Swiss-Prot record, chain A:
Main subcellular localisation: nucleus
Keywords for this protein: Biological rhythms, Cell cycle, Cell division, Chromosome, Developmental protein, Disease variant, DNA damage, DNA repair, Mitosis, Nucleus, Phosphoprotein, Transcription, Transcription regulation
Organism classification: Eukaryota, Metazoa, Chordata, Craniata, Vertebrata
Effect noted on mutating residue 420 to D: In a breast cancer sample; somatic mutation
One GO CC term on file: site of double-strand break
Region listing for Required for homodimerization and for interaction with CRY1 and CHEK1, in residue ranges: 1-300
Gene name for this UniProt entry: TIMELESS
Protein name per its UniProtKB record: Protein timeless homolog
Disease: Advanced sleep phase syndrome, familial, 4: An autosomal dominant disorder characterized by very early sleep onset and offset. Individuals are 'morning larks' with a 4 hours advance of the sleep, temperature and melatonin rhythms.
UniProt note: domains: Residues 1182-1199 comprise a putative nuclear localization signal; nuclear localization is required for the regulation of period length of the circadian clock.
Cystine residue pairs: none
Tissue: Expressed in all tissues examined including brain, heart, lung, liver, skeletal muscle, kidney, placenta, pancreas, spleen, thymus and testis. Highest levels of expression in placenta, pancreas, thymus and testis.
Curated annotation (Swiss-Prot), chain B:
Highest taxon listed in the record's lineage: Eukaryota
Assembly: Interacts with TIMELESS (via N-terminus), which impairs TIMELESS self-association. Associates with the MCM2-7 complex. Interacts with RPA2, PRDX2.
Name by which UniProt lists this protein: TIMELESS-interacting protein
Disulfide bonds: none
Residue numbers of the full-length protein present here: 61 to 147 of 301
Family: Belongs to the CSM3 family.
Region described as Interaction with TIMELESS: 7-83
Function: Plays an important role in the control of DNA replication and the maintenance of replication fork stability. Important for cell survival after DNA damage or replication stress. May be specifically required for the ATR-CHEK1 pathway in the replication checkpoint induced by hydroxyurea or ultraviolet light. Forms a complex with TIMELESS and this complex regulates DNA replication processes under both normal and stress conditions, stabilizes replication forks and influences both CHEK1 phosphorylation and the intra-S phase checkpoint in response to genotoxic stress.
Compartments, as annotated in UniProt: Cytoplasm; Nucleus
UniProtKB/Swiss-Prot annotation, chain C:
Gene induction: Expression peaks at S/G2 phases of the cell cycle.
Organism per entry: Homo sapiens
Domain notes: The C-terminus of the protein contains 3 potential CHEK1-binding motifs (CKB motifs). Potential phosphorylation sites within CKB motif 1 and CKB motif 2 are required for interaction with CHEK1.
Superkingdom classification of source: Eukaryota
Quaternary structure (record): Interacts (phosphorylation-dependent) with CHEK1; regulates CLSPN function in checkpoint for DNA damage and replication. Interacts with ATR and RAD9A and these interactions are slightly reduced during checkpoint activation. Interacts with BRCA1 and this interaction increases during checkpoint activation. Interacts with TIMELESS; the interaction is required for leading-strand replication. Associates with the MCM2-7 complex and other replisome factors. Interacts (via the acidic patch) with CDC7; the interaction is required for phosphorylation of MCM proteins and CLASPIN by CDC7.
Protein name: Claspin
Gene name tied to this protein: CLSPN
Subcellular location: Nucleus
PTM remark: Phosphorylated. Undergoes ATR-dependent phosphorylation by CHEK1 during activation of DNA replication or damage checkpoints. Phosphorylation by CSNK1G1/CK1 promotes CHEK1 binding. Phosphorylated by CDC7 during DNA replication, phosphorylation inhibits interaction between the acidic patch and N-terminal segments leading to increased binding to DNA and PCNA.
Family note: Belongs to the claspin family.
Length: 636, 87, 36
DNA sequence: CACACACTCTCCAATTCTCTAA
């Protein structure tokens, strides 16, 4: 502690708004680098320097006021890169014991502090001016090393998880990430990233710039981002007032339902009743104590508690909630998406795929590739759609690449038990890219150009002719697990399956498409009967449970697919389940049932079919209890 | 000591289980077309009562989540195909 | 049956045909026009 | 003190891992 304190304090003193450096500050930062290179496994020097706030106190002023001293400046850059190194790299993995997890949290906290400090615009101003000089110069080993360390510093400062206990910030208040992005915008380093992506002379940095862009966009999604016009602020003011109004009215309605559920007498107003026609758990009739108003809508679980499901059985949950970034940052990010899609997408994505071909990329950089393939394609689909700006990734090669990556992640999820959630998150990225490619090949049919219509028919013909793109949905549904995959994965999978079946229906009903794969015959309803499985309907019902929280498009997709599977294939008895009937009971008893007309009508249809079967025979009630295989044909 | 009930296939094939479920709806009546919500409420009320009598420890939805899995087992399945049709 | 064979051949040719798109990449320009 | 908090300690059994038949 003492030697580190002496060496760090040796660097310089800060006077007001100016920083004065001691003559041996270069040797001082070299000593700090030496200590960091000889840390303990607890990352003790990183902890101590973060606690001392030496980065904010000394290195940022040195960066912003003594960048002319080049031998000091590059050492300061390397030191900042080492200090800002992400905690997962510092420890190798997320620890699983209390002491090392505490050390991880402490280092992470100091990374929060570093990210908050780097939002000062002068830091990225100096970095952008330096990198501008370097790219004008671009060439030496030291020069490209300095470029790499500047880009790694930007990557490091962008890549910290936000401590949302302290960043517990509302709808469009500027987060630390928002302020960092705004500082990048004001310093003009976004223009340098655009130059690196658009330029063909230095494509080795294209992978790094893709990483920088992927870390820039984390809260945002393209459909909302593309619609941020200049007049959006006034619209969002009125929208916020309307949302508050409907929320308050909903809460008042819920309060009144609860008030009418209980009586108007006080809690200890006694009196007990016997329900003569209702047996208790014994032989005698049930004695009820909670009042007539609780009997008016009687349930046999009023007094019970939920069960403690064990840790290994609990469902997965969402890792994020949609706080928007500040509106100015949203405008800047929309402009960045526009310029990136126009000037940068094709060359950068070709260079990144070339990097994957050369196989010098790290072990999971295709996740960044598939992120961009989802994000910027969907941004192009939003607002004015133009396939010419994004032509490169429409190749069938991208479909094959996504398919092999998705199947690899699927197998690793099924085998690599200790890392299954991360493999699920990678498979979700691949699924999202696949969905967006299905969306764009759907979209371009509406375009007026015969050439891209020809390209669309080519892509659809080969993609529906090749079987492995087709059977992947059945594989995903058959091995979907709520315990590992969040509800957003299931939502995206259902949306993708609905879109894929829609396009396949249109293709088969407008063209022959008579053979698949070595040709073998094919018809559309044969493939649809594959989805007539207990697991598939179980997953669809699992997503249907959240119908209030689901988007309207998600409800449309789920009810459309279930209505297809029940009506057109004539397999209503597959959907006869008692959990499903509880879902329908809550759906029909919903006060907001009028907003879900398709869902309630479908529920009444399937219920009418069930009660027809029940009127035929009493066996329907017993068969309703248990999930059911192809022997359902007895019931039908 | 430790006389804790379990809700396994032996519980489900007990008298209160599927043999009872074969008979609980003998007293029931339904309105049919255009009143499927009311018929559903009566249906869930009857089977919720049956679940409560069979295994009072659980809430109804949790009981359904248990039993929908537990029906796969061979003992309760053989008793199911006995209850279906007749012995 | 001969029609089935001809359908297989023609759809093979259609799915094998290369893509045609309104491809472009915009004007190259040095870092000065980007940064300032 | 005899009737309640708080903690430790013990064995039962609830759920998953692995091998096998349909």
């Amino acid at each position: 502690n003492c030697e580190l304190l002496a060496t760090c304090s040796a660097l310089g003193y800060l006077e007001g708004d100016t920083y004065h450096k001691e003559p041996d500050c270069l040797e001082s930062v070299k000593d700090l680098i030496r200590y960091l290179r000889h840390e303990d496994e607890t990352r003790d020097v990183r902890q101590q320097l973060g606690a001392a706030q030496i980065l904010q106190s000394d290195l940022l002023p040195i960066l912003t006021q003594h960048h002319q001293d080049k031998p000091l400046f590059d050492a300061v850059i390397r030191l900042m890169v080492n200090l800002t190194q992400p905690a997962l790299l510092c420890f190798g993995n997320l620890p699983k014991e209390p002491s090392f997890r505490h050390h991880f949290l402490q280092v992470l906290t100091y990374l929060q502090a570093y990210k908050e400090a780097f939002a000062s615009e002068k830091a990225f101003g100096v970095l952008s001016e330096t990198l501008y000089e370097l790219l004008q110069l671009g060439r030496q080993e030291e020069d490209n090393l300095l470029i790499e360390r500047i880009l790694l510093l930007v990557r490091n400062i962008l890549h910290v998880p936000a401590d949302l206990d302290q960043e517990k910030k509302i709808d469009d208040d500027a987060s630390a990430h928002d302020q960092l992005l705004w500082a990048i915008h004001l310093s003009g380093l976004d223009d340098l990233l655009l130059f690196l992506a658009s330029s063909s002379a230095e494509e080795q940095w294209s992978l790094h710039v893709l990483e920088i862009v992927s870390l820039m966009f984390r809260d945002q999604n393209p459909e909302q981002l593309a619609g941020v016009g200049q007049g959006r602020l006034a619209q969002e003011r009125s929208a916020d007032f309307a949302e508050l109004e409907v929320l308050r009215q909903r809460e008042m309605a819920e309060k009144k339902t609860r008030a009418l559920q209980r009586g108007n007498r006080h809690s200890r107003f006694g009196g007990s009743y016997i329900v003569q026609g209702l047996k208790s758990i014994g032989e005698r009739d049930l004695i009820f104590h909670k009042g007539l108003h609780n009997l008016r809508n009687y349930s046999s679980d009023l007094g019970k508690q939920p069960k403690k499901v064990p840790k290994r059985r609990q469902a997965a949950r969402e890792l994020s909630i949609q706080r928007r970034s500040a509106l100015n940052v949203r405008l800047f990010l929309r402009d960045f998406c526009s310029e990136f899609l126009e000037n940068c997408y094709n060359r950068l994505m070709g260079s990144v795929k070339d990097h994957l071909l050369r196989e010098k990329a790290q072990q999971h950089d295709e996740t960044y590739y598939m992120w961009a393939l989802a994000f910027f394609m969907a941004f192009n689909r939003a607002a004015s759609f133009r396939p010419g700006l994004v032509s490169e990734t429409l190749s069938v090669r991208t479909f094959h690449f996504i398919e092999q990556n998705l199947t690899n992640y699927y197998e690793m999820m099924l085998t690599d038990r200790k890392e299954a959630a991360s493999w699920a998150r990678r498979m979700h990225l691949a699924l999202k890219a696949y969905q967006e490619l299905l969306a764009t090949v759907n979209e371009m049919d509406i375009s007026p150009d015969e050439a891209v219509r020809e390209s669309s028919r080519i892509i659809k013909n080969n993609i529906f002719y090749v079987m492995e793109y087709r059977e992947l949905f059945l594989a995903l549904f058959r091995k979907f697990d709520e315990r590992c995959q969040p509800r957003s994965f299931l939502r995206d999978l259902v949306e993708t399956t609905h879109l894929f079946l829609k396009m396949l229906e249109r293709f088969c009903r407008s063209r022959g498409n008579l053979v698949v794969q070595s040709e073998k015959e094919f018809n559309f309803l044969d493939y649809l009967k594959r989805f007539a499985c207990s697991t598939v309907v179980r997953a669809y019902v699992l997503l249907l449970r959240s119908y209030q929280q689901n988007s309207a498009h998600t409800n449309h997709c789920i009810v459309k697919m279930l209505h297809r599977l029940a009506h057109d294939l004539k397999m209503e008895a597959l959907l006869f389940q008692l959990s499903v009937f509880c879902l329908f009971n809550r759906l029909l008893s919903d006060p907001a049932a009028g907003a879900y007309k398709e869902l309630v009508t479908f529920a009444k249809y399937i219920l009418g079919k069930f009660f027809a079967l029940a009127a035929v025979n009493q066996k329907a009630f017993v068969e309703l209890l248990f999930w059911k295989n192809t022997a359902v044909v007895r019931e039908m | 000591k430790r006389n804790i009930p379990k809700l396994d296939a032996q519980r489900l094939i007990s008298e209160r289980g599927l043999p009872a479920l074969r008979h609980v709806f003998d007293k029931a009546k339904f309105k049919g077309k255009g009143h499927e919500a009311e018929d559903l409420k009566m249906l869930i009320r009857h089977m919720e009562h049956w679940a409560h009598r069979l295994f009072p420890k659980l809430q109804f939805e949790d009981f359904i989540d248990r039993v929908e899995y537990l029906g796969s087992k061979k003992e309760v399945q053989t008793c199911l195909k006995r209850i279906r049709l007749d012995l | 049956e001969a029609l089935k064979q001809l359908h297989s051949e023609t759809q093979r040719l259609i799915r094998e045909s290369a893509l045609n798109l309104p491809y472009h990449m915009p004007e190259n320009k040095t870092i000065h026009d980007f940064f300032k």
